[PDB]
Amino acid sequence: RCDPIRISMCQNLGYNVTKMPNLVGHELQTDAELQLTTFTPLIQYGCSSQLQFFLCSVYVPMCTEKINIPIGPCGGMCLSVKRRCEPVLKEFGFAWPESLNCSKFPPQNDHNHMCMEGP
Ligand SMILES: *[C@@H]1O[C@H](CO)[C@@H](O)[C@H](O)[C@H]1NC(C)=O
Numbered sequence: 001r002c003d004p005i006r007i008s009m010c011q012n013l014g015y016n017v018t019k020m021p022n023l024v025g026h027e028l029q030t031d032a033e034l035q036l037t038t039f040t041p042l043i044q045y046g047c048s049s050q051l052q053f054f055l056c057s058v059y060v061p062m063c064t065e066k067i068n069i070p071i072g073p074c075g076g077m078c079l080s081v082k083r084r085c086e087p088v089l090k091e092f093g094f095a096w097p098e099s100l101n102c103s104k105f106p107p108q109n110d111h112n113h114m115c116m117e118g119p
Pocket residue numbers: 101102103104
């Protein structure tokens with residue numbers, strides 16, 4: 001039931017496969033890819049080496065056969081990326097979006113909570 005990742009910028013991660021919809025609302029990987037291109041300059045900037053993984057974990061969350069929820073990022077990784085990259089966005093009059101609000105992810109990977117804590 002898991003589909004291969006078709007987004008070229010989300011390829012050499014820990015995982016190979018996804019299932020839509022993602023944590024942003026897209027039913028189609030192509031819609032996620034288009035929206036993700038917004039961030040490639042921020043990724044090239046290199047405010048956080050975890051940014052690419054964080055974004056991919058949100059736009060194409062991990063899929064496994066044994067689990068039937070998508071697996072996105074833990075809230076600690078989100079915070080670590082936000083704290084480094086938000087100040088760069090604010091220089092250009094941009095803000096960290098609600099769609100990546102770190103409180104909406106699980107604080108840590110628990111028995112309560114399934115999430116990827118990042119590399
Ligand atoms: C982020 O989400 C939390 C939890 O839903 C919400 O309470 C909060 O309003 C959001 N953060 C901010 C700064 O509004």
